[PDB]
A paper describes a structure:
We describe the development of a biologic that takes advantage of the proximity of the N-terminus of bound [name] to the three-fold symmetry axis of the spike protein to create an ultrapotent, trivalent [name] entry antagonist. Therefore, we sought trimeric scaffolds to fuse three [name] moieties and leverage the inherent symmetry of the spike trimer to maximize avidity. Thus, we determined a trimeric antagonist fused to the N-terminus of [name] would require a short peptide linker and would be less likely to form inter-spike interactions. The collagen VIII trimerization domain is significantly larger than the collagen [name] domain (44.7 kDa and 19.3 kDa, respectively), but more importantly, previous studies reported that collagen VIII melts at ~45 °C66, whereas the collagen [name] domain melts at ~85 °C (vide infra). Given these observations, the smaller, more thermally stable collagen [name] trimerization domain was advanced to develop the trimeric antagonist.
We then sought to prevent the dissociation of the collagen [name] trimer via the introduction of intermolecular disulfide bonds, despite the high reported trimerization constant (where 50% of the trimer is monomeric) of 56 pM49. Cysteine mutations capable of creating inter-chain disulfide associations (i.e., C®-C® distances less than 6 Å and absence of obvious steric clashes) were identified: G22–F'26, E31–V'37, and G(-1)–L’5. The parental construct yielded ~1.7 mg·L−1 purified protein (n = 1); the disulfide mutants, [name]–V'37C and G(-1)C–L’5C constructs, yielded each ~1 mg·L−1 protein each (n = 1); whereas the G22C–F'26C mutant only yielded ~0.05–0.2 mg·L−1 protein (n = 2). The formation of inter-chain disulfide bonds was confirmed by X-ray diffraction studies. High-resolution crystal structures of the [name]–V'37C and G(-1)C–L’5C mutants afforded clear electron density for the disulfide bonds in both mutants (respectively). Furthermore, the thermal stability of each collagen disulfide mutant was assessed by DSF. The ‘wildtype’ collagen [name] trimerization domain produced a calculated melting temperature of 84.9 ± 0.2 °C. However, two of the disulfide mutants (G(-1)C–L’5C and [name]–V'37C) either produced very low or no fluorescent intensity up to 100 °C. Considering the high melting temperature of the “parental” collagen [name], we posit that the melting temperatures of the disulfide mutants exceed 100 °C. Given the poor expression of the G22C–F'26C mutant with our trimeric [name] constructs, we proceeded with [name]–V'37C. The introduction of [name]–V'37C to the trimerization domain of T3A (termed TD3A) afforded a melting temperature of 51.1 ± 0.03 °C. Combining the disulfide mutations, TD3A with T3AD (termed TD3AD), further increased the melting temperature to 56.5 ± 0.01 °C.
Residue numbers in the entry:
A (entry chain A): -2 to 53
B (entry chain B), C (entry chain C): -2 to 54
Write the structure that this text describes.
């Protein structure tokens, strides 16, 4: 059982130019609207998140 | 404040035979269905994911 | 295109005492309630998780 991780970008614009480099099974975070995805074998799945709050 | 990470397996079958060894607080990726779980102290929680798309829109 | 990770705390209160040290884009696991959050700039988004089960369902 291998390991992956989480890759980060500040903006969607920057992410879209580089996301092809992300290996399968890694997570992808885009800071501007606090979005999270996971990379699949042949696509992407968006993680479902509740609304942003200052506290948990 | 310690760190965990993400563990991955290619198939559900492969995962189910080894996943008990994953420590609490790690994420678990199963490539076959492109699914994610979180390891709890006593069990697992499945992450809700939207359907697969070609790009992260 | 940097990298982040996952960090672990036992409780919401323990986490909150350290959260200023957590940058945006890190995932946060809280063992009490087996909950997962993502750090945003100035806050958190809770990951939607299904119910805890003994096996990955």
């Amino acid at each position: 059982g291998g390991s992956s991780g989480v890759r980060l970008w500040a903006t969607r614009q920057a992410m879209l130019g580089q996301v092809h480099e992300v290996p399968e099974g890694w997570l992808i975070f885009v800071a501007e609207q606090c979005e999270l995805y996971v990379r699949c074998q042949n696509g992407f799945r968006k993680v479902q998140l509740e609304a942003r709050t200052p506290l948990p």
